[PDB]
Symmetry: C4
Subunit: 450 residues, 4 copies
């Protein structure tokens, strides 16, 4: 065997089947409308159509060999897959899109390729590929815009073909509206035919209108309907363009809107230009160093038993340098990684101060912190990455003259990325295995006596 | 009896009255402006107008026979309904729209059907039908787009009629702007008249402008006002189109935006392509198997005493296979169905692990789980649908060497849809009837000894 | 005083000063550009300009006599108000807009009314009136759309005047682009002048372009700049139109989106058409009876000491029929009115059932409820409006064989609007005055014995 | 060293390098396409190009001398900065944009300035400056709109240059579509050349289309592609304009939407016009006095150890007049400034009333309050700014006949801005230093006895 739709093989086949479906959606109508296209390159159209039909057949086979999830397990029983396929509307659409209507080439002649129009009924495969690509691609907005542009181009191409067909029905050159006479040297070339039809279609759907006005009632009606199709469908698609660009700007726009609200508040309250500059510097840091997004709000949509792995694969850089995690229990790190709230501190920010509520443990992910003196400048100890502080005031200790108080003040030399671990959480998670707690308050007593 | 507006009969009548109202809103102005329309098909217009008026009268009768809610009860007293009708502005509008202005046909002649313009004053019924359909239809966006297209078409039709009337007032063919001379063979046909007027209207309201420029001051003024009506009203309607397409994409766009934020985080943090593929697979599963929507956020707008029924009608498939619910008390299932949080687990995800906080009971809705050994591969027990686990570590038990600990580790073979029932909730809800609890810890002791 | 800007007198004056400001913003540029406008109606323009200037002077006086809030109190000291006025930029703008530039009529002649262009510098007053109207009017969206249309019209009018002025500078009729020769009988009329200039302006700003193309470099540059002004500013304004219509649809669109999510869930889960019809009926009820909006989310932006008055003025209809409130303490009703959560129940919905957690007291605002038998049909007692139930299981009672249990089952005959009062809240709020509690458990014992 | 990108020097250099990048992005294509531009002002183009290249070199030097943050510290080691630069793609782009392609002037002649097209590869610097300006400027929306207008102008300019180049390739005047013959006196001027090309570009990108239709297939194709570029890219940019105006209106629109929901509720519930006027007055006050924004929601994105400084720099005006803060401990004010919830009370609003739950302490930021008698009018004490009340009922006091009760009723004479400090918070924060608490209940006893 089976293909496992989640796999890469299924996605690759989705591409390989979208190619014929897109080809069919573009060219069947073109060949049906522009007769010279069908006739001049008939030897190539036959090859391409037969290859497309072969790929359609192989796609039907793949649909027979693609497993589905019952009880969460991939069904691998062949006949079960055949039944699941045939019971779905997709099998009906596939049989309809693979009906050998090409036999009508013997009746209607080689000049009627619209018999292959049923081949469009595999559009679903194409759309599936798109909805898969949009999910799996690393450039979701580039692909989304390319998809919208493809839809625009297909719509304009189809409307060009429709215009040319209507000109044919009315008669080429019978009036100033229809496509001019084919017998003209310049206006008889297939290139000119298609490109002028596309020009007309673009002017009509984009509602520019710089085309000869209608002459007949059918022409007036078609032009009204087509200008309305233009207005509505092009507003739809080119406003989807707008929404895609909006969601492209979503993060940056939200960040900038927050900054603007802050600046409005500061200018209204006449906040000192010192503090205004400090705030602007904080936000410039958040942007430049790519910290505007908070991983919590993003990863909250992941499963906890997958977001856990995510956090581990991101923070194993530091949670191996820490003494508590991955050293004593070697598994405890998972119990708290999904609750280590990542904070960022500016240069000179006092994370801790003597005589404060010690309700948070900190793990230094990045940055240089200092166990300073209360004078403000004298740096007693420099804590680099992997260090952990703020854990002594969490625990119950014998001989602690300072209970629930910070034993020292910790300031940040530079921008520090820390993991604030709350006291309640450390309490709750160390209950399972105190084999790490013993050396934890080993460190605790050792630092509390000195 | 009375009609009970909530019923299907009332909605069917809403359709049957919207038909004449729509007919009146489309055709009265057309016949008033295009005199040949009124004259040539007068025998049909008379029949249709009289049928419309009869339906208007029957709609007034229905309004007299439609109950309203006082004290939440449907008023069935006839005279009370007559008073409620006559006291509402709707009765005034109905009498105004049913005034026999057709008598003016004897004074103004058969060439003045705008006397029936008062018939438009039942627009409310039409709109009511729409606002009912949008609520009750299964295709809300299809109907909404059809409604907007109907508004566009009606506006363009009315503007075409207005253009033709203005041409008539100025005189057909008196200058290049107005509709050409009626005496022309081609430009005198009612078909050509209406269709060219519609063409002009479309070019003006869509602001394409490929029409002969005005000549007189009245023409310049009307064209300015009409181009502005075009800009404003068509932006309104065709931006409502945009918002409707947006809300069509709302679920998919939110899902894809979450996926994009996740992928941005993973690529920025250089998350391993293993875990990136796992996350993409999780999201592909959520989409393909239609799990992107969380029933909680959707059904939270339902009444609890209706959302309860909803959850029952959805989850009675599994809550009959469970041993606790619908078996001992047979009513307890409602006390917890509105708090069974549905979770989804990937293949191989450890739902439970030995030595963890047993604070959640799980009911396997769909999927195969395994009571494995801690080695990781040896599957002791396979739990299929209807099974419940994680309930032993919830309860107070005699002789439990493992208190508040998982007696075994449960992993998911495939994608498991479970119902996580919190410990606090099971505690709170079993307090009412311990007739099920006794066999609950029957199972508990039986599994805790073996 | 003083005038007290919050008062109605200040708003009326805002209108009376917006009239000259709007007049000045519309007509000064018109008279400056269309010389015939200035000249032909000079006797009227002089009167209107002098009246506008008098009103400007009276507006300056009002600004001297309008109090401001210092320490939250309206300043009534005259000289303090004069200082507050003169210290503001508004005084500078007012003196600039009232500078007697009309004296230049003696130097530049009566054909130069753009000397009155400084009169536009009172635009602020106009805008203030708008921002006041939008706040105080009952039709905020009608006024907002009218304001946007006024901006559109003013922009188009100004661009028409600019086009005519540029034609004058280049010379009327010197090329096909500029306004045609004034000496023409038809193209020399002030009506034709202004209306064709407005036509050109509309075609340019709405970017239709059906105007003679530029000839000179200045014309090309102006047309480029004006088409870009068109694109940008008209997108701005006519997209503000879109956002205004969106916020017009905001409530209805949110309601309908909730209904659509519900219907999607129900159709996906194959919810029985019984329950689907019940849900659709619930939502039809919510809409038809105007219950889609929840007063909590709306009134949460009001002050509690004003939202309290709001809730009182709305619910004094029923909280006078209740026995506890406005009867014993006569002031207790305010302590709980801001926490009476309004619920709606469908016909047949069991609000209470025997043997359930009695943690909510209910006050029947509207609707008929029944104290039924557990059989389901036998109605023991019918509770109409003003009745209160679910209070016995809240209180501590002697001789209650049923503790924390519902003494009877309450069902809703029809759609009941109730006030669910939580047990914790009744406990917390009755602590202040048990003078009502005594008769409360009077009723309690009386019903618990029978 | 180093430059410290957060500093003002780096931003100034960002401007000084954006000037050549913008110059290059505007003029290289212009000179490449309009040959007369390159030739006539070659002496000036050479100077400007060499100055631009010198500034590019100095920008490369700056990039070598700009520190980056490792461990949150600004790297000042020269060679480390050289490595960080050369290891980034920016160094590749800078070397590519500074390659001396001007040497090709000796081969291709002075008429080929597109060899300087590589100079566009420093676009990043320009964009960086923009993203810095948008952050640091006080007019974020003005700058954003200016940036979008710059993008529009650059796109139109580039498309004008492209049109002129295509006309050159096809041949000037070979058909009606291309730019006319250069040999024409009027259509040969560089001014006319560029300005008509810009006119064509504006008509095409804004999709007005009032230009001669294409003649050749290449012209038709280019016009189709360019009209589509117009539609898509101009919708993008001029809808970004819409979103920028939306976020300009965001605060005012949210405020007005809240007011509209309130007014809809009040008119639907038939709220008395007294209370409707009171609510409208409250909202008029909120707007006029600039209180629609709540500093909590804005400043919650700031760091707590920066939002603290913000609140201090804003509220030190009053927290120096208070007796508790900045007087006894002199540091306690920071422990509670981030939890002082700012409330606003209308004139006559009873903040406190005798016999109520004293769970909030109030600090009068602005406004006159009264310790009144319960009669309602007799004002015992007038509390101005700096005063604090509601603190007696917070504390545990000996001899308090009124426990957890308000000792008096406090009403607001005028609009009072207060700081509501919750009881729990005062309890929690005074635990650290009771040196202020002693005089706190000094005041407490002193007022409780009298
Ligand atoms: N007092 C003290 N604290 C230190 C030293 N080195 C690291 N620390 C950390 O500084 C922290 C300050 O807050 P805590 O008292 O909670 O915990 C303290 C220790 O974790 C040291 O040498 N002396
Ligand atoms: N230990 C054990 N647990 C089982 C077995 N079969 C099912 N389970 C479930 O596995 C669950 C693991 O978590 P709990 O200990 O809370 O509850 C356990 C039982 O509900 C079994 O055979 N042995
Ligand atoms: N048992 C009983 N309850 C009644 C009667 N009339 C009204 N009620 C209300 O029905 C309510 C059901 O819930 P509670 O027991 O909390 O409170 C009960 C009473 O408030 C009655 O006649 N008998
Ligand atoms: N009773 C009384 N209260 C006063 C007086 N002056 C100020 N107050 C304040 O009024 C407040 C009312 O609420 P509290 O009793 O909590 O605290 C009271 C005091 O803080 C006074 O003279 N008498
Ligand atoms: Ca257009
Ligand atoms: Ca046009």
């Amino acid at each position: 065997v089976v293909i496992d739709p989640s796999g890469n093989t299924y996605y690759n086949w989705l591409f390989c089947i979208t190619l014929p479906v897109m080809y069919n959606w573009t060219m069947v109508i073109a060949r049906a409308c522009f007769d010279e296209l069908q006739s001049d390159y008939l030897e190539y159209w036959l090859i391409l159509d037969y290859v497309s039909d072969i790929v359609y057949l192989i796609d039907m086979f793949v649909r027979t060999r693609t497993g589905y999830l019952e009880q969460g397990l991939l069904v691998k029983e062949e006949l079960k897959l055949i039944n699941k396929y045939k019971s779905n509307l997709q099998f009906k659409l596939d049989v309809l899109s693979l009906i050998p209507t090409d036999l009508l080439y013997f009746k209607l002649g080689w000049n009627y390729p619209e018999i292959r129009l049923n081949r469009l009924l595999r559009f679903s495969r194409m759309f599936e590929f798109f909805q898969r690509t949009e999910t799996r691609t690393n450039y979701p907005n580039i692909f989304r815009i390319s998809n919208l542009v493809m839809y625009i181009v297909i719509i304009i191409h189809w409307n060009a073909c429709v215009f040319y067909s209507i000109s044919k029905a009315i008669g080429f050159g019978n009036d100033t509206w229809v496509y001019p006479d084919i017998n003209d040297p310049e206006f008889g070339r297939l290139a000119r035919k298609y490109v002028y039809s596309l020009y007309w279609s673009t002017l009509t759907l984009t509602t520019i209108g710089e085309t000869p006005p209608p002459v007949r009632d059918s022409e007036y009606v078609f032009v009204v309907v087509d200008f309305l199709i233009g207005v509505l469908i092009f507003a739809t698609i080119v406003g989807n363009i707008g929404s895609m660009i909006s969601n492209m700007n979503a993060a940056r726009a939200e960040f900038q809107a927050r900054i603007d609200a802050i600046k409005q508040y500061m200018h209204f309250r006449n906040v000192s230009k010192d503090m205004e500059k400090r705030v602007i510097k904080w936000f410039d840091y958040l942007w430049t160093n790519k910290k505007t997004v908070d991983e919590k709000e993003v990863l909250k949509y992941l499963p906890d038993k997958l977001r856990a792995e995510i956090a581990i694969n991101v923070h194993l850089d530091t949670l191996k340098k820490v003494r508590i995690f991955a050293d004593c229990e070697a598994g405890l790190l998972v119990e708290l990684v999904l609750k280590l709230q990542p904070q960022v501190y500016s240069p000179g920010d006092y994370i801790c101060k003597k005589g404060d509520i010690g309700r948070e443990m900190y793990i230094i992910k990045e940055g240089k912190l200092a166990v300073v003196a209360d004078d403000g400048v004298t740096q007693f100890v420099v804590l680099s990455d992997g260090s952990y502080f703020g854990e002594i005031s969490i625990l119950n200790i014998k001989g602690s003259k300072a209970g629930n108080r910070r034993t020292a003040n910790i300031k940040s030399i530079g921008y520090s990325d820390l993991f604030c671990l709350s006291k309640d959480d450390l309490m709750e998670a160390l209950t399972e295995y105190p084999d790490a707690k013993t050396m934890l308050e080993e460190k605790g007593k050792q630092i509390l006596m000195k």
